[PDB]
Structures are given as C-alpha cells and as structure tokens.
Amino acid sequence: WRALLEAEKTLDSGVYNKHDLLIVRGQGARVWDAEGNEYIDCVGGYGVANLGHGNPEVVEAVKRQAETLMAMPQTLPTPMRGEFYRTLTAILPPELNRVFPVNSGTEANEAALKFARAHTGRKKFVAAMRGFSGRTMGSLSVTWEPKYREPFLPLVEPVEFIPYNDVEALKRAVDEETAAVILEPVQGEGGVRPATPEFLRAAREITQEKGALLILDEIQTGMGRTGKRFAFEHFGIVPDILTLAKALGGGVPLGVAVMREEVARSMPKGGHGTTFGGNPLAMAAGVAAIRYLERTRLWERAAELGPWFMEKLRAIPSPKIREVRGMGLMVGLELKEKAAPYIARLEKEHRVLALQAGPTVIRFLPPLVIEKEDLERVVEAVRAVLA
Amino acid sequence: WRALLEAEKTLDSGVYNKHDLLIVRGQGARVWDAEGNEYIDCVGGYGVANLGHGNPEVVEAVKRQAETLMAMPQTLPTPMRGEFYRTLTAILPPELNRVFPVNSGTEANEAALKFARAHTGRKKFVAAMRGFSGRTMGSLSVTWEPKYREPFLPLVEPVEFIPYNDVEALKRAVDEETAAVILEPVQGEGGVRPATPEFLRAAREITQEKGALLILDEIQTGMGRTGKRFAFEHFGIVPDILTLAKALGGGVPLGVAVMREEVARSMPKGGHGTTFGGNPLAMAAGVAAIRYLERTRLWERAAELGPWFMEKLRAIPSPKIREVRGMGLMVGLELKEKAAPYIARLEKEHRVLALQAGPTVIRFLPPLVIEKEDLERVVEAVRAVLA
Ligand SMILES: CC(=O)N[C@@H](CCCNCc1c(COP(=O)(O)O)cnc(C)c1O)C(=O)O
Ligand SMILES: CC(=O)N[C@@H](CCCNCc1c(COP(=O)(O)O)cnc(C)c1O)C(=O)O
C-alpha cells in the first residue's frame, strides 16, 4: 500500500496538503487506514458523508442503478431524474419547485449566479466577507478569501463583499442594479459562523425590496447538518434560489440549484447546461439519500448531539480555547493559536480526523449517524492534545 | 411511467428541449423507453458511453467501491485515487505527469485556465470560434456561441477568438500577454470540425515560442472516440494541459486536468480545489474504464467503423446532404436545411436516437461497442427519413 500513497503524492497536482496515511474504507463514522488502524472521522469527506460511510440504502441504490443505466442527457427523460425532482421539491417550500441538477457545489452556485443574471438583467452580486462559494471562476468571484482570488484576476465583475451579519452594510450594498445576494446560513470555510436571524431576515427583505434575488448556499449546512432538514428552516426565510451539494448524493458527485418558477422561466432555451448534471446514477443516489434522511429524520440526531457535544467541548479547562460555536453537528472550536499542530496530533496520537476552518479553528463535520461514545472520545482527544 | 415523465418535464428548469419518451435502461449501444421499445443509441450519454451501456467491468468497480468508501477528500490519500493517477498518466506521454481530478469537463477546463494564469503570470486567453469549453462562468468565457455568453456578461476577460484552423490568425493572436490557447482536436458542439495537422502543429509551436500554454480539450474527443486513445495522438503533439471528462469514468461523474509538472508546481498551496474531485467512487470507475479501454484497444473499433460509416452516409442519394465529416466514431452529417425534423423522424419511425451539432447537422456519438449491423441500420434510417 506504500506504493499507492507515494503515487498519489507524487502524481498529484501538489495544491493539496496531503496527510501521511492511506484511508481505505469506512462504515458509519469510522474509517480505517492501510495498516488496520481505526479512526473516528469528524471530517466525513468535508460534510459529504452525513448519512454515514456505507449507508446501505444509498449503496444499494447505487448498485442497482449502475447496472441499469448511468449515461443519459437532459434531452432524454429518464425515470430516476423525474423521481429525484419530485423527491427533492417535496421536502422544500412549494415555492422552490424548479430544479437544475449539477455535479458539485461550485457548479450549483455557478448555476445560481447565471439564472440570477438572466432573470434580472442586472450584473452585480453581493456576498459576505469570508464567504465560500466554489473554485470555478464564477463561484470564485463571490468567494472572499483574497489569496484564493488574486492570482486568477480578473474574475467576473462586479462583486461587492459586506461583513457577515452586518445588517446595515447589507442594506447599503443592495441596489436596483444588484442581480443577487449569495450567503451561507452558517459560514463553513469561514470558521463555522452562524448567521443571525436579523441578518438573514434583512437579506430576504432587502432583495425583494430592490428586485434582487436571494441565493442561499446550503451546500455544507444542507441535508440535516445543522439540526433541521435545511438551516433556512431555522431562520424562517425562503430564498429565490437554493444551492445544495456534498451530502445530497450520499457520496455520488451531486448538486442542485432549486429555484422559483418565474426565475427558471426567464432562462432562455439552451442558455445553460451540463453533460453529467442530472445523470441517472446521481439521480438514483439523491433519491435514496433524501428518502433515508426523511425516513430517519436524521437531522434530529444533529439537533440532539450537536448541543451535547459542544457543551462537552466548552467544558475542557484549556486557556487556548476562545469559543465553541456552530449549529447541529457543524461545530467549530476556535483556539487562540494555530490549529494545524493539534489536528495533526489528533490524527497520529488519537486516531481522530478533524478539519480546519481558518488557521485557528478545528472544525467537526461528523457523519450524522455518529454515536455519543465517539463524541466523548473526540472531546477527550481534544482535551488531551491541548493540555 | 407517464407520471415520472411529466414530473421531469414539469419540475425541470426548462432550459432543455426534452424528447417525448422516457429511457429506462441501456446495454451496449441499445436503450429501452418505458413502453418497452428498443433504440439504437447514437447519443450515448452524449459521448459518455464510449465503453458501452452497462459495461461489466465499470459496473463491477462501481458496485465494489460503493460498498467500501465513497467520500474522502484530497487531504486524506486513498488507494483508488493513487491508482487512478498512475493508471491515467501511464496511458499518456511522459510530460503529462500531474493530475488534478474533478467532476465534469467544464471543471476540467476551469482548472486548466486557473493553473495557466498561476503559471504564466499572464491573463489573456485565446480560443477558437465555434469552440466550446463549458457552462461555468470561467469556461463560458472561452466558449464561442454568442447566445451562450450574451446574457451573462461581463464574463472573464480578456479573451480573444480566432477562426478555427486559421494558422496565421492564431499566430498573430498569441503574444507575451497570452497565458494559454485552448482548443478541441475536433470541435464537437461546433458541428464536428476536425483540426488540420498544420493547425494543431502551429498551436504547439506558437505557444512554446511565446511562452503561453497549450490547452487541448479532449473531453469529447477522448477515450478512443476518434480512432486513437486520444486525438492528439493523430497529430503527434503534446499539450501543456490536457482536459478530460465524459467517458473518463464509464458513466460516473468524472473529469480531469493532466499537466506538465512545471505547470502543476506553480499552483500555490490551496490555490484551487474541489470537494468531490478525486473521490474514491469516481477514481475506481476511472481505473476500470481505462483498464478496459487499454485491454480491448477499443479505439480501433472507432478507427475501423468510423471511415466505413462515414462513406456509407456519403453514398446516400439525397440532394439534402451537404457534407459528411468527423474522426473515428465522432461524426457529423450536415444537411442543406434544419436537422431537428429529421432527428424526430429517426426517433419516432426508426428507434434511432441522434444528436445535433448545430441546426443543420446531425451528430453521431455512438458507444464504441456498437455493432456494424447497427451502423448499417442507422444509415438506412437516415436515407429513409430524408426521402
Ligand atoms: C444537453 C446539454 O446540457 N448539453 C451541454 C453540452 C454537453 C457536451 N459538451 C461538453 C463539452 C465540455 C463541457 O463539459 P461538461 O461540463 O458538460 O461535462 C467541454 N469541452 C468539450 C469539447 C465538450 O464537448 C451544454 O449545452 O452545456
Ligand atoms: C481540500 C479541498 O479540496 N477543499 C475545497 C473546499 C471544500 C468545501 N467547501 C465547499 C463549498 C462549496 C464549493 O462546493 P464544491 O465545488 O467543493 O462541491 C460551495 N459552498 C459552500 C458553503 C461550501 O462549503 C477547496 O479548498 O476548494
């Protein structure tokens, strides 16, 4: 197995910080390396494995569809597509009744940004500082992190960034020339920073007032992650465009921009598209994923465990800890120093896999099926490495 | 079944022209609608089913990897990824030895454009008229079709288009300002237009002389479609970045940007990325797809049937036929009127699903495993419908 690791490391583009280990398989919220070591996976593929590694129903759906049909374009209707369509819209407010399936989060936002422009005839986009929307050039344009943007300038214009949760700043940025505002109900890559009810409320009201669209990015907070099916249910607001990805396919590269009918209706024929978007395999996976989510109301696990976990974290007697924040099982542990050293130690010394969300934040995105015994172990592990 | 169709038609964004039928399963180059009818699939997942619908090896690989692990990021090495990397670079010339995996063709080109700006420090992009690179804002900027860009402007600048196959045009276009040239060895969406040896040759020579990068988009021409493993093999040139997708994963959403190490090396850590890009499910399907292609040298079938198919089409006695062209099984039949009505007859009266490559061109992108008898049947259907 040493050869594969070296092959991946050597042949990789080199843009990634790869860890010295080879993960071979997973079940639930546990994963194993090539040497047999077992790990608690709070990385869960960056919040993709919400339903847990090896979710039977999803796996089964993927097997049966792979045998039946995998390649079929949007020009040729195929059963799983129609099913995914009504299956996804049925768990959303009736207003969001139109879907443009894609293959990733960045593509979903790319779709949002484009439909927004075709519909309004406006060009400007408003986003929040420390907001992450994707790496493709359109999505990168509304992505704040300067170092992620500067080397590839110029990108799509014009875009205006406003401090996250700053209601008055939002109010002043959005005008009649604004095509849309794009925000995350809880900023992920930006440190796990939950939106305030007033901020999102303001974002909703402002946009309708100026004729701008509201694009809510639930690519990371979606699929029960925050405690409810979607975090926008926490704020009582309903967007014009909702973008989803990650856990949407239960692992299969899947994403979608769901929007109001008048919005989708303004898009000219052949005005946008995608080869893979809406393929039968991804459609069969999403159907399965959504049905498991709803059948088990998996968001409840996150609502119950999220608080308990964060409470334990806030109990760790360590002066290096600034704050414990998040919603559901989307948690961030902000330290008063670099988080990287501790993450490396959680892995090597405690077989615990965690992510970052900015240099001083240890982020936890465990499969929602994770058990309380593993949560206590994570806490213990953290207390340990910080001592 | 009628429920699932109206549902798909009704809940879709509406940017696609959908055919009146519902495809349920496929095998080889045959597909079945919901009423039990069988079709010869000249659409092939839109050039994605090169290895045949239901290809045993790919299906098998997907089923087994789905049971093992599907979600795992680029920061955590995983066996199938390491394998995909070495298996892919192994079927390519030695200069293309670095891999940046993604989830679609457009993502592939976006990464190509980005790595190009990061490497040359330049900004200008040169593309060809009738060229197609993708729908995401970045790829859309180097895509020709005015009506595809028109309503989404302003996009990424600065971009210069030159007439396809115009050597002197391209030469005057590429300067010390150019980060890269992006071209398809054979324009697909642009109506199936093969490059000439002299043109691609100049693109390689000019780019090197001027220090700009050559991006060869083989997303549609790749994986044996034109008669050889990759279309560049016909021309004896090696680009700086090679973008793939469509058939690369036997059906599973997958694409990739393969580049020379100096180009990969210039990308700052975390300068680019993707959640799904390089996921184990796609990596395992990509290994299987390539092994199958290499074991059967599948491209020889296109190389053998392609010319034999194109001459059969040309020999049709219809004054409506203008020209027949293509490479291997990437074929386009241009008529002296609108194709759409004819494609409709092909479907309704002959159970033959085909595509367009512009309003007057019928395009064929059949699985490479298609039988000769099925191609003979196709020709008869075309002759019949044009009477
Ligand atoms: C039915 C549909 O949606 N059609 C797509 C087109 C699909 C086929 N072309 C893809 C393609 C692409 C874009 O690849 P992707 O994102 O569709 O996977 C890039 N380069 C070349 C040479 C290509 O042929 C569209 O209109 O956007
Ligand atoms: C190491 C790596 O590749 N990580 C990615 C980031 C992954 C997680 N973020 C995804 C994301 C995206 C982009 O989605 P996708 O293309 O990765 O599927 C959009 N919106 C929100 C709220 C998101 O959280 C990167 O560095 O580009």
PDB file of C-alpha atoms in Angstrom, chain A residues 51 55 57-58 61 83-92 99 223 229-230 244 247-250 254 256 258 282-299:
ATOM      1  CA  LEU A  51     -25.688   9.638   6.194  1.00  0.00           C
ATOM      2  CA  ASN A  55     -25.214   3.838   4.164  1.00  0.00           C
ATOM      3  CA  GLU A  57     -29.835   2.179   1.189  1.00  0.00           C
ATOM      4  CA  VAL A  58     -27.628   4.609  -0.724  1.00  0.00           C
ATOM      5  CA  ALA A  61     -29.426   2.369  -4.906  1.00  0.00           C
ATOM      6  CA  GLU A  83     -38.201  10.978  -9.258  1.00  0.00           C
ATOM      7  CA  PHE A  84     -35.290  12.991  -7.851  1.00  0.00           C
ATOM      8  CA  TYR A  85     -37.100  16.123  -8.999  1.00  0.00           C
ATOM      9  CA  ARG A  86     -40.349  15.497  -7.135  1.00  0.00           C
ATOM     10  CA  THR A  87     -38.451  13.869  -4.265  1.00  0.00           C
ATOM     11  CA  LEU A  88     -36.299  16.932  -3.606  1.00  0.00           C
ATOM     12  CA  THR A  89     -39.034  19.539  -4.142  1.00  0.00           C
ATOM     13  CA  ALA A  90     -41.379  17.650  -1.803  1.00  0.00           C
ATOM     14  CA  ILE A  91     -39.063  18.426   1.128  1.00  0.00           C
ATOM     15  CA  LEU A  92     -38.835  22.125   0.204  1.00  0.00           C
ATOM     16  CA  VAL A  99     -34.535  22.143 -10.362  1.00  0.00           C
ATOM     17  CA  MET A 223     -29.153  17.627   4.487  1.00  0.00           C
ATOM     18  CA  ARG A 229     -33.502  19.440   7.209  1.00  0.00           C
ATOM     19  CA  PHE A 230     -32.073  22.734   5.975  1.00  0.00           C
ATOM     20  CA  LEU A 244     -27.113  22.133  -2.477  1.00  0.00           C
ATOM     21  CA  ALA A 247     -24.352  15.100   1.192  1.00  0.00           C
ATOM     22  CA  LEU A 248     -27.060  15.471  -1.479  1.00  0.00           C
ATOM     23  CA  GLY A 249     -25.894  12.377  -3.379  1.00  0.00           C
ATOM     24  CA  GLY A 250     -24.738  10.461  -0.318  1.00  0.00           C
ATOM     25  CA  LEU A 254     -24.268  15.507  -6.921  1.00  0.00           C
ATOM     26  CA  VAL A 256     -28.525  21.226  -7.424  1.00  0.00           C
ATOM     27  CA  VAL A 258     -33.530  24.725  -6.879  1.00  0.00           C
ATOM     28  CA  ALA A 282     -26.613  10.665  -9.379  1.00  0.00           C
ATOM     29  CA  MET A 283     -30.385  10.918  -9.567  1.00  0.00           C
ATOM     30  CA  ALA A 284     -30.847   7.422  -8.120  1.00  0.00           C
ATOM     31  CA  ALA A 285     -28.366   8.234  -5.337  1.00  0.00           C
ATOM     32  CA  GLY A 286     -30.039  11.510  -4.390  1.00  0.00           C
ATOM     33  CA  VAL A 287     -33.463   9.854  -4.286  1.00  0.00           C
ATOM     34  CA  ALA A 288     -32.069   7.223  -1.935  1.00  0.00           C
ATOM     35  CA  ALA A 289     -30.214   9.805   0.151  1.00  0.00           C
ATOM     36  CA  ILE A 290     -33.265  12.018   0.607  1.00  0.00           C
ATOM     37  CA  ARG A 291     -35.518   9.055   1.461  1.00  0.00           C
ATOM     38  CA  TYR A 292     -33.175   7.863   4.192  1.00  0.00           C
ATOM     39  CA  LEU A 293     -32.864  11.400   5.549  1.00  0.00           C
ATOM     40  CA  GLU A 294     -36.644  11.815   5.734  1.00  0.00           C
ATOM     41  CA  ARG A 295     -37.405   8.299   6.938  1.00  0.00           C
ATOM     42  CA  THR A 296     -34.978   8.634   9.832  1.00  0.00           C
ATOM     43  CA  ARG A 297     -35.387  12.401  10.341  1.00  0.00           C
ATOM     44  CA  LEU A 298     -31.598  12.250  10.690  1.00  0.00           C
ATOM     45  CA  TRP A 299     -31.489  15.977  11.410  1.00  0.00           C
TER      46      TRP A 299
END
